[PDB]
Design an enzyme around this catalytic site. Structure first.
Site, PDB file in Angstrom:
ATOM      1  N   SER A  32       0.828  -1.216   0.000  1.00  0.00           N
ATOM      2  CA  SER A  32       0.000   0.000   0.000  1.00  0.00           C
ATOM      3  C   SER A  32       0.864   1.269   0.000  1.00  0.00           C
ATOM      4  O   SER A  32       0.512   2.270  -0.629  1.00  0.00           O
ATOM      5  CB  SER A  32      -0.952   0.024   1.202  1.00  0.00           C
ATOM      6  N   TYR A  34       4.286   1.500  -1.048  1.00  0.00           N
ATOM      7  CA  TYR A  34       4.894   1.563  -2.372  1.00  0.00           C
ATOM      8  C   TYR A  34       3.935   2.113  -3.406  1.00  0.00           C
ATOM      9  O   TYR A  34       4.287   3.044  -4.130  1.00  0.00           O
ATOM     10  CB  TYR A  34       5.367   0.200  -2.882  1.00  0.00           C
ATOM     11  N   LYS A 111      21.547 -23.094 -13.079  1.00  0.00           N
ATOM     12  CA  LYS A 111      21.268 -22.659 -14.416  1.00  0.00           C
ATOM     13  C   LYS A 111      19.794 -22.383 -14.506  1.00  0.00           C
ATOM     14  O   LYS A 111      18.968 -23.304 -14.542  1.00  0.00           O
ATOM     15  CB  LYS A 111      21.634 -23.745 -15.430  1.00  0.00           C
ATOM     16  N   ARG A 132      19.518 -13.069 -26.281  1.00  0.00           N
ATOM     17  CA  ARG A 132      20.802 -13.675 -26.675  1.00  0.00           C
ATOM     18  C   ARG A 132      20.839 -13.893 -28.193  1.00  0.00           C
ATOM     19  O   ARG A 132      21.870 -13.696 -28.849  1.00  0.00           O
ATOM     20  CB  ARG A 132      21.016 -14.975 -25.896  1.00  0.00           C
ATOM     21  N   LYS A 282      32.119 -23.533 -13.237  1.00  0.00           N
ATOM     22  CA  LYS A 282      33.183 -22.757 -13.876  1.00  0.00           C
ATOM     23  C   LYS A 282      34.434 -22.837 -13.056  1.00  0.00           C
ATOM     24  O   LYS A 282      34.379 -22.820 -11.864  1.00  0.00           O
ATOM     25  CB  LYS A 282      32.799 -21.281 -14.025  1.00  0.00           C
ATOM     26  N   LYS A 306      23.210 -30.885 -17.062  1.00  0.00           N
ATOM     27  CA  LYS A 306      21.770 -30.840 -17.334  1.00  0.00           C
ATOM     28  C   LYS A 306      21.009 -31.930 -16.560  1.00  0.00           C
ATOM     29  O   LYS A 306      21.339 -33.113 -16.649  1.00  0.00           O
ATOM     30  CB  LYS A 306      21.520 -30.981 -18.839  1.00  0.00           C
TER      31      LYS A 306
HETATM   32 CL1  LIG Z   1      29.131 -18.345 -19.558  1.00  0.00          CL
HETATM   33  C1  LIG Z   1      27.520 -18.817 -19.113  1.00  0.00           C
HETATM   34  C2  LIG Z   1      26.630 -19.180 -20.100  1.00  0.00           C
HETATM   35  N1  LIG Z   1      25.382 -19.549 -19.806  1.00  0.00           N
HETATM   36  C3  LIG Z   1      25.080 -19.537 -18.506  1.00  0.00           C
HETATM   37  C4  LIG Z   1      25.992 -19.170 -17.522  1.00  0.00           C
HETATM   38  C5  LIG Z   1      25.638 -19.163 -16.105  1.00  0.00           C
HETATM   39  N2  LIG Z   1      24.417 -19.386 -15.590  1.00  0.00           N
HETATM   40  C6  LIG Z   1      24.513 -19.290 -14.268  1.00  0.00           C
HETATM   41  N3  LIG Z   1      25.747 -19.014 -13.938  1.00  0.00           N
HETATM   42  N4  LIG Z   1      26.475 -18.931 -15.108  1.00  0.00           N
HETATM   43  N5  LIG Z   1      27.250 -18.796 -17.819  1.00  0.00           N
END
Ligand SMILES: Clc1cncc(-c2nc[nH]n2)n1
Length: 308
Positions: A32, A34, A111, A132, A282, A306
């Site tokens: 309310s 906001y 992801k 993308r 990564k 996946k």
């Molecule tokens: Cl480089 C890349 C490409 N697609 C997804 C991701 C990602 N998604 C979550 N963390 N990093 N990184």
């Protein structure tokens, strides 16, 4: 009239409240409040349009300006990840790395099953948001993306960067959207991702505005103005710059930790408020990523596990 004090105060409060609700999930104020302040600013801007600004909270409601959908090259192409489907795939991935560069730390992340996007900032202002597309060329949906509170309109430091993220619809908003469509005998969206896509593909940013979308940012095209020495540092830095990142990320020391993370999220993914389609792993250290290089298609330093 000189309304600068009240305008500035309204900017301050609405920016605070938006961040609390949509980035932290921790409101300090009821809706309310906001709504009331937003309505006041909207009236101020209608009656005194000299107070409109590019990064005004009112931007979030959408406008008359239509997303061009023009084909636009990203400043830097968005990477394509190789996939993993089981433990052996991940042990191979890990082995390739450790044979070439030694033992590494890994960054593990969810992801998000979203629409991949690039968000370009110039002098710290959000100025272009692209799908993308094919990784090189996307479609300009800037005007629609501006309605997503989780995308900052202005960063904490005036950088020129292109961040990368996934735009998505939280599950519960997807489900309640489909309830609304069921009541009006409309075709239901197949899933959250398709609903987010339909919402960002509108010509009308005002429709996008009322859909409940968010984003998680996972990287940037250029690390020149980042102090981060690693992916985990980089995400923390994005947080401090004003972006929305995923808090379920973890740094792990080895591939056992990676497997542990995937084992954890396989069971807990059910409880997340958004859909994920995998887990991205990564090499954490940025210098080590650089060392590993790329294949013809993909980073050698990252892989997408996946889910079945
Ligand atoms: Cl480089 C890349 C490409 N697609 C997804 C991701 C990602 N998604 C979550 N963390 N990093 N990184």
């Amino acid at each position: 009239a000189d309304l600068s004090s009240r305008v500035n105060e309204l900017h301050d409060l609405l920016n605070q409240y938006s961040y609390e609700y949509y980035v932290e999930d921790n409101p300090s104020v009821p809706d309310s409040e906001y709504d009331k302040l937003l309505h006041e600013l909207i009236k101020i801007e209608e009656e005194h349009p000299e107070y409109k600004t590019v990064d005004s909270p009112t931007v979030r409601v959408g406008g008359e300006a239509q997303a061009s959908f023009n084909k636009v090259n990203h400043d830097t192409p968005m990477l394509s990840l190789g996939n993993a489907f089981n433990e052996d795939d991940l042990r191979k991935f890990d082995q390739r790395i450790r044979e070439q560069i030694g033992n590494v730390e890994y960054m593990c992340e969810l992801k998000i099953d979203g629409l991949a996007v690039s968000l370009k900032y110039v002098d710290g202002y959000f100025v272009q948001g692209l799908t993308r597309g094919d990784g090189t060329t996307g479609e300009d949906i800037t005007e629609n993306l501006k309605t997503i509170h989780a995308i900052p309109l202005k960063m904490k430091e005036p950088l020129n960067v292109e961040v990368r993220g996934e735009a998505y619809m939280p599950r519960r908003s997807f489900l309640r959207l489909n309830e609304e469509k069921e009541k009006n005998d409309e075709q239901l969206f197949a899933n959250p991702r398709n609903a987010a896509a339909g919402s960002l593909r509108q010509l009308d940013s005002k429709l996008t505005a009322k859909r409940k979308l968010s984003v998680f940012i996972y990287s940037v095209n250029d690390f020149t103005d980042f102090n981060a020495r690693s992916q985990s540092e980089a995400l923390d830095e994005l947080d401090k710059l004003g972006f929305t990142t995923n808090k379920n990320r973890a740094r792990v020391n080895n591939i056992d930790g990676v497997l542990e993370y995937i084992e954890k999220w396989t069971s807990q993914r059910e409880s997340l408020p958004y859909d994920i389609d995998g887990i991205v792993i990564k090499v954490n250290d940025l210098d080590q990523q650089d060392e590993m290089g790329f294949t013809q298609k993909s980073p050698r330093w990252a892989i997408a596990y996946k889910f079945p």
